[PDB]
C-alpha cells in the first residue's frame, strides 16, 4: 500500500491569554501584524476565514487587518506627490507585509510589541521613511492596540491609518447599533443617506462610511449571544466604517483616521513631521449584557 498525505502550511503564530478572564488571542506577525482570532470564555469574538487564510495570496477575511498608509482605494490607484506619481493598492501595504516582534510583557496584561519599517519596495509606492510600532495588549475582556506612527525621514508625511475588525455575528436581525452620526456614505453607490440609529444588517451588503461622528466610540449589542462589542478610539480616528454581507457571519465596525481618497482630497488626512512621530490607540471591549 502506497499512501501520501500532507500537513498544510501554518505561519509563526503568537498566542496571548489571561487564564483569569479565560481570554486567548492569536496574532500572526508575518502576515501584517494581524490579530486573527480572539476568544473570551471560549466564545469567538472575532470572525476568521481559516481556509481562505491558507492561500497566502488571498486577502485576509476576518481578524483585524491594518490599513496604512491609506484606507480604501484611490482613483486610478494613485496619488501625486511633489510632481511625481505613486501607485497604492486598496488599504495600503501594511496588511501585506511581515512585522517583527520587538517586545513582550506579561505583568499588567498579555502584551506583544510589533514593528513595521519602510523599505525600498515601500518607498516606491509611498516615498516616506515611516516606522510603525504597535502594541497589542490583552486583558480581561478587552483588546487594546497602541500605535506610534513615526516619520524617520526629512519631510512631512501624510497618511491614513485604520483597523478593520471582523466581529463575529450570526443573528444580524437582533443586532442593536450605536453609531454616533446622523448620516453615512454607501461607498458602493457613493450616495449619502440619513441615519436614524438603526439599520437592516440582514441586507445583501452594507458598506457604510460615517465620516461625521460625535463620539470617540461606538458599539453594537447582539442578544442572541447576549453581549455587546464596543469600539473606542483616540482622536486620530474621525471616521467609522461598517462592512457586512449576506451569508458571511461578521460585522465590521471600523475606526479610520480618514475616509477613502484622503491622501488626495486632504479630508481628515494626517501628518507626521520629519524625524518625529505621533501615537494613537483603539480599544475593543466585550460585555455580557
DSSP H helices in the chain: 120-123, 262-265
Q: How far is CA 37 from the centre of its chain?
A: 13
Q: Is the distance from CB of 152 to CB of 275 less than 8 angstroms?
A: yes
Secondary structure letter of residue 56 according to DSSP: T
Query: For the chain, how are helix, strand and coil distributed in percent, rounded to 5?
Result: 5, 45, 45
Q: Which helix (H) or strand (E) holds 284?
A: strand 276-287
Q: How many domains does the chain have?
A: 1
State the Cα–Cα distance between residues 12 and 266, nearest whole angstrom: 38
C-alpha cell at 231: 469600539
C-alpha cell at 260: 477613502
271 preceded by cis ω (within 30°)? no
Secondary structure letter of residue 120 according to DSSP: H
Q: Is the distance from CB of 150 to CB of 131 less than 8 angstroms?
A: yes
Task: Write the CATH number for 107.
Answer: 2.70.98.10
- Beta-carbon contacts of 165 under 8 Å, excluding residues fewer than 6 positions away, are 46, 63, 64, 231, 252, 253, 254, 284
Three-state secondary-structure class, residue 77: helix
Beta bridge partners of 229: 220, 286
Q: What is the resolution of this structure in A?
A: 2.6
Domain that holds residue 210: 2-289
C-alpha cell at 136: 497589542
CA atoms within 13 A on the CB side of 175: 27
Q: How far is CA 148 from the centre of its chain?
A: 15
- Beta-carbon contacts of 175 under 8 Å, excluding residues fewer than 6 positions away, are 169, 201, 220, 221, 222, 251
State the Cα–Cα distance between residues 166 and 250, nearest whole angstrom: 6
Q: How far is CA 131 from the centre of its chain?
A: 18
| Listed residue (262, 275, 279) closest to 129, CA to CA | 275
Beta bridge partners of 220: 177, 229
- Beta-carbon contacts of 78 under 8 Å, excluding residues fewer than 6 positions away, are 85, 86, 87, 88
Q: Is the distance from CB of 50 to CB of 28 less than 8 angstroms?
A: no
**Burial label, 104 (beta-carbon count in 10 A; 0-12, 13-18, 19+):** exposed
Q: How many CB atoms lie within 10 A of CB 214?
A: 9
For 5, 58, 112, the CA distances from 53, given in Å and listed in that order, are: 20, 7, 22
Amino acid at each position: 500500500m502506497y499512501n501520501i498525505s500532507f500537513t498544510p502550511d501554518r505561519p509563526l503564530t503568537y498566542h496571548l491569554e489571561d487564564d483569569q478572564s479565560l481570554a486567548r488571542l492569536s496574532l500572526v506577525p508575518g502576515r501584517g501584524g494581524l490579530v486573527t482570532e480572539w476568544t473570551v470564555q471560549g466564545q469567538p469574538i472575532l470572525y476568521f476565514d481559516r481556509e481562505r487564510f491558507q492561500d497566502p495570496s488571498l486577502s485576509v477575511r476576518g481578524g483585524i487587518p491594518i490599513l496604512f498608509p491609506i484606507c480604501g482605494n484611490l482613483p486610478q490607484d494613485q496619488f501625486n506627490h511633489a510632481g511625481k506619481s505613486y501607485r497604492l493598492k486598496q488599504h495600503g501595504f501594511a496588511r501585506d507585509l511581515p512585522w517583527e516582534v520587538i517586545g513582550q510583557q506579561t505583568q499588567d496584561n498579555a502584551r506583544l510589541d510589533l514593528r513595521l519599517s519602510h523599505n525600498d519596495a515601500t518607498l516606491e509606492a509611498f516615498p516616506f521613511a515611516f516606522e510603525l510600532v504597535f502594541s497589542y495588549q490583552l486583558q480581561g475582556h478587552s483588546l487594546r492596540i497602541e500605535q506610534r506612527i513615526a516619520n524617520l525621514g526629512d519631510q512631512r508625511m501624510p497618511f491614513s491609518l485604520g483597523f478593520h475588525p471582523y466581529f463575529f455575528c450570526r443573528e444580524k436581525l437582533g443586532i442593536t447599533l450605536a453609531i454616533p452620526a446622523n448620516d453615512y456614505l454607501d461607498q458602493k453607490t457613493g450616495d449619502c443617506h440619513g441615519y436614524d440609529g438603526q439599520l437592516n444588517l440582514t441586507s445583501p451588503e452594507l458598506d457604510l462610511a460615517f465620516t461625521q461622528i460625535s463620539q470617540p466610540r461606538a458599539h453594537f449589542i447582539d442578544p442572541d449571544r447576549n453581549l455587546k462589542i464596543e469600539v473606542s478610539f483616540s482622536e486620530l480616528y474621525q471616521t467609522l466604517v461598517l462592512w457586512t454581507v449576506a451569508g458571511k457571519d461578521y460585522l465590521c465596525l471600523e475606526p479610520w483616521s480618514g475616509p477613502r481618497n484622503a491622501l488626495n482630497s486632504g479630508e481628515q488626512l494626517a501628518w507626521v513631521e520629519p524625524y518625529s512621530s505621533r501615537s494613537a490607540w483603539v480599544n475593543f471591549q466585550v460585555s455580557t449584557e
